[PDB]
Amino acid sequence: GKIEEGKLVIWINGDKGYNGLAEVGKKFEKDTGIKVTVEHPDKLEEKFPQVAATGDGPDIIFWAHDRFGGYAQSGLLAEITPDKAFQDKLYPFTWDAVRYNGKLIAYPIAVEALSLIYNKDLLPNPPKTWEEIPALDKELKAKGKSALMFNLQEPYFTWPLIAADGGYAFKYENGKYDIKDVGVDNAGAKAGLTFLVDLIKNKHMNADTDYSIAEAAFNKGETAMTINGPWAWSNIDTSKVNYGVTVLPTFKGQPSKPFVGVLSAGINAASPNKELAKEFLENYLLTDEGLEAVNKDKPLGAVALKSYEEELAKDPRIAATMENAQKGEIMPNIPQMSAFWYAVRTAVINAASGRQTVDEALKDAQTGSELYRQSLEIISRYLREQATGAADTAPMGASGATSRKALETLRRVGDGVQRNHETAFQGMLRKLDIKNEDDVKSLSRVMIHVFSDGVTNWGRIVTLISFGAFVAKHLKTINQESCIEPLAESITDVLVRTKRDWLVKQRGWDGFVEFFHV
Ligand SMILES: CO[C@H]1/C=C/C[C@H](C)[C@@H](C)S(=O)(=O)NC(=O)c2ccc3c(c2)N(C[C@@H]2CCO[C@H]21)C[C@@]1(CCCc2cc(Cl)ccc21)CO3
Ligand SMILES: OC[C@H]1O[C@H](O[C@H]2[C@H](O)[C@@H](O)[C@@H](O)O[C@@H]2CO)[C@H](O)[C@@H](O)[C@@H]1O
């Protein structure tokens, strides 16, 4: 579809201050005559990339910054170009959160971190350690209360415990991510998730607890503690619970490490209202008055706007938010975050329910989180060596035996396919008439149509990749060798997005190697 010119449609999550945001919209309308519609659809972070890819969706999307790199990589976001005067009004680290491939892709709004929230009438002093919670629950159960309830359906809430003893998403060293180094199934991650599963086994928590259930229990005074972000404080205020906000408990003597989000506002690349969107965000929302309107509805956390943050920083709840943030880590914004979160979501739910053991659950999560990078390594190497006649001398890196053996297998089976099906391959090549980088960009749709709509098996995956090598050879011969790595990226994207679940179920590329073992 087509986004309508002369209005603004905004999407924001239903846990945020969307009524406050709508008030800012009304102020904008009063000056400009432009109606601002604020919506909070379910699963908006999944809906956005689907609808925006067709030139549809909201003019402005609000989410934590972690999702925005994927959106930017997909061409769904307009580049943000504020002047120096405006940029200087926000904290530099918040702009860093919304930078992707050297470009600003959103406006930062506020810094969010989970804290421990406790009922002072039940628990005058909160526990300093996770390890003491079982004994505390026993004391409280005898009085008809429980120690702790929080959302076990979203891995955002369990991550601080998984990370505490050494779990990590993507390793960060010497000022850089090693995207090849994933820390989801190490001893530290296992210890944290085992502690969570044991809480459930011992009836201190219930696997089915979600956001609404935990919120209701805390706000009714039934449970002594919860884990939540600043947005939750409004409903607690309304409940009149005598609450405190504090540092998360330690695990094995180490801080809980929340993944820190920067609520950010991106402009849809398909919007015909980009100038209106920039005006709204810079001159209405990111002002003391604008942020106050949203914050009074549901608190934002530590806002990006320096002038207003100076007022808010005096609040002990914000001090606690920032203490927890400093103990955690700013989320990456790399496109692979979506897959990481899906993988860990499934692991936590399956481990909590008993569907998988902790070891089984985190193994699958590691495979899911590594899948893009490993698939690209294999596919890129095969395409490039096929096109040039010479292999890549670079070390395979992480999980290198699997990558090496997969590439060996692919050489054997993929060369066979190209030989036996040379006629069909040559015919399809000529039909597609691939001349340049723009023509390569058009293949994704065709690949999804032909590949993804068909039986899922390793044979069809070999055809996908082998035909890719056939195209790569063609690109080299016509002096378009620069198109090969984009092509490999495109093939990988199609494969891992459309066959994610199946691939993880096969043990990924180890399954491929076993399937074609001579
Ligand atoms: C009938 O004519 C097809 C040949 C089939 C022989 C094959 C052995 C079957 C018996 S099979 O094993 O069942 N596999 C598939 O049918 C199959 C799986 C994946 C595919 C395809 C087929 N494609 C159509 C093929 C290619 C040769 O003739 C078609 C290519 C594909 C769509 C075009 C654009 C494009 C661009 C890039 Cl870079 C990469 C891939 C593509 C998508 O990937
Ligand atoms: O649970 C995975 C989930 O975590 C984060 O989402 C948070 C969000 O940042 C908060 O603003 C608040 O709305 O709670 C969400 C968790 O339910 C990531 O930002 C998100 O991408 C990820 O899927």
Q: Among 377, 379, 348, which residue's Cα sits nearest to residue 468?
A: 379
Q: Rounded distance, CA 154 to CA 108, Å?
A: 23
Which residue from 423, 442, 467 has its CB within 8 A of the most atoms of ligand 1, so it is best to mutate? 467
SS (H, E, C) 417-438: HHHHCHHHHHHHHHHHCCCCHH
Which residue from 449, 464, 473 has its CB within 8 A of the most atoms of ligand 1, so it is best to mutate? 464
CATH assignment of the domain containing 461: 1.10.437.10
User: What separation in Å is there between the alpha carbon of 463 and the centre of ligand 1?
Assistant: 5
User: What separation in Å is there between the alpha carbon of 324 and the centre of ligand 2?
Assistant: 16
Q: Kindly list the distances between the CA atom of residue 207 and the CA atoms of 144, 213, 215, 264, in Å, as whole numbers in the listed order.
A: 20, 11, 15, 31
User: What separation in Å is there between the alpha carbon of 480 and the centre of ligand 1?
Assistant: 22
Which residue from 156, 159, 184, 344 has its CB within 8 A of the most atoms of ligand 2, so it is best to mutate? 156
Question: Both tokens of residue 377?
Answer: 């390594």
- What residue type is assigned to position 124 of the chain? P
Q: Which domain holds residue 397?
A: 337-516
Q: Among 123, 153, 329, 325, which residue's Cα sits nearest to residue 230?
A: 325
The answer to whether residues 252 and 127 belong to one domain is yes
In degrees and rounded to multiples of 5, residue 264 shows phi and psi of: -135, 155
The answer to whether residues 341 and 243 belong to one domain is no
User: What separation in Å is there between the alpha carbon of 451 and the centre of ligand 1?
Assistant: 7
CATH assignment of the domain containing 142: 3.40.190.10
Q: Rounded distance, CA 74 to CA 81, Å?
A: 19
418 lines ligand 1 (CB under 6 A): no
Which residue from 18, 109, 154 has its CB within 8 A of the most atoms of ligand 2, so it is best to mutate? 154
Question: Both tokens of residue 470?
Answer: 């056939």
- What residue type is assigned to position 83 of the chain? D
User: What separation in Å is there between the alpha carbon of 430 and the centre of ligand 1?
Assistant: 14
User: What separation in Å is there between the alpha carbon of 217 and the centre of ligand 2?
Assistant: 21
Q: Among 124, 149, 116, which residue's Cα sits nearest to residue 228?
A: 116
User: What separation in Å is there between the alpha carbon of 305 and the centre of ligand 1?
Assistant: 52
Nearest CA to ligand 1 atom 10: 460
- The resolution, in Å, is 1.4
**Atom nearest to 155 CA in ligand 2:** 1
User: What separation in Å is there between the alpha carbon of 156 and the centre of ligand 2?
Assistant: 6
463 lines ligand 1 (CB under 6 A): yes
Pairing of strands 8-11, 60-64: parallel
Strand, helix or coil at 242? Answer: coil
Residues 6+ apart with CB under 8 A from 397: 180, 377, 403
Q: Which residues pair with 250 in a beta bridge?
A: 129
Long-range contacts of 506-510 (CB under 8 A, 24+ apart): 506/458, 507/367, 508/367, 508/370, 508/371, 508/374, 508/375, 508/402, 509/374, 509/375, 509/378, 509/402, 509/403, 509/406, 510/402
Q: Among 63, 65, 252, which residue's Cα sits nearest to residue 162?
A: 252
User: What separation in Å is there between the alpha carbon of 438 and the centre of ligand 1?
Assistant: 21
Question: Both tokens of residue 418?
Answer: 């190209």
424 lines ligand 1 (CB under 6 A): yes
Residues 6+ apart with CB under 8 A from 194: 358
416 lines ligand 1 (CB under 6 A): no
Q: Rounded distance, CA 506 to CA 487, Å?
A: 25
Give the HSE-up count for residue 146: Cα atoms under 13 Å, Cβ half-sphere: 18
382 lines ligand 1 (CB under 6 A): no
User: What separation in Å is there between the alpha carbon of 256 and the centre of ligand 2?
Assistant: 17
Q: Rounded distance, CA 193 to CA 157, Å?
A: 12
Nearest CA to ligand 1 atom 18: 460
451 lines ligand 1 (CB under 6 A): yes
The answer to whether residues 236 and 364 belong to one domain is no
